Amino acid sequence: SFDPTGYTLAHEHLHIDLSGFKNNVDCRLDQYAFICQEMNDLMTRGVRNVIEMTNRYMGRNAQFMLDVMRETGINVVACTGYYQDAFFPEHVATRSVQELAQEMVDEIEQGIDGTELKAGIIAEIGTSEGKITPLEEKVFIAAALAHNQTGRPISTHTSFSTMGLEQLALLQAHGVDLSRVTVGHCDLKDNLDNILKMIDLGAYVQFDTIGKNSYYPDEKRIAMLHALRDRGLLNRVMLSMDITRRSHLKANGGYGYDYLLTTFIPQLRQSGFSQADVDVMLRENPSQFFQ
Ligand SMILES: [Zn+2]
Ligand SMILES: [Zn+2]
């Protein structure tokens, strides 16, 4: 299963389909051969695990993930949960918070999509830009309930690096040990103040939008990583690319998942990070958090 001797990409999508919400086939990331080739490339750079963030109604495909693992040998940790307000199915409003929690618990305990594969994390649970809507609050409470019963960690989605502290306060008010929560997308803006506060509360933070330079530059992500390294806070930071589109794949003229290792990490080491510093974020942290 999980291989603690190798690297872990903390937030990725291997099979996601948000094409129906957008009317864009680019958002239907389901090109098997290409995805398998990308996993083989990751394997050559020491990656052994990928935490998949596609929950049921985001277009998850357990069989596809089982197949990718069978073909490449990479380990994929599947998730369970609900996305964000704009993408919620109608039933998030009509079901009770208890029913939502039960669903997440069964996906963790029995299996997902009719297969033998089980969800290993409650994720990607998100909030909207600059606000937590009533339905998102309900989903976060359900996540808290499912975590309090199964102990599986919670991995979130912050919209443009907003509301992270609010997500933590909500989860903690519902009995969640914040060391079991990792805040996604903290790297889409100058977000040091919030990040330091989140780490102070005991949560893990993620710089998982590496390569998405039209949103925020990698140079600035590197500067923020240095601020964390300077304060001895690297043991709370995890990394990823958050690949979501066909155009992100190398076969389609994109940068691919391994861009993290072929390009970003080399720039990070060039700016001063030791390989040990890198290994804390890519190997140590995930092994301690995801298991
Ligand atoms: Zn996300
Ligand atoms: Zn994502």
UniProtKB/Swiss-Prot annotation:
Activity regulation text: Activity is higher in the enzyme containing Mn(2+) than that containing Zn(2+).
Gene Ontology molecular function: any one: hydrolase activity, acting on ester bonds
PROSITE patterns cross-referenced by the UniProt entry: PHOSPHOTRIESTERASE_1, PHOSPHOTRIESTERASE_2
Domain of life of the organism encoding this protein: Bacteria
E.C. no: 3.1.-.-
InterPro entries: AryldialkylPase_Zn-BS, Metal_Hydrolase, Phosphotriesterase
Keywords attached to this entry: Hydrolase, Metal-binding, Zinc
CDD domains linked: PTE
GO biological process terms, semicolon-separated: catabolic process
Binding residues for beta-D-glucose: 147-148, 175, 177, 180, 279, 283
Protein name: Phosphotriesterase homology protein
Species for this entry: Escherichia coli (strain K12)
Classification lineage: Bacteria, Pseudomonadati, Pseudomonadota, Gammaproteobacteria, Enterobacterales
The gene coding this protein: php
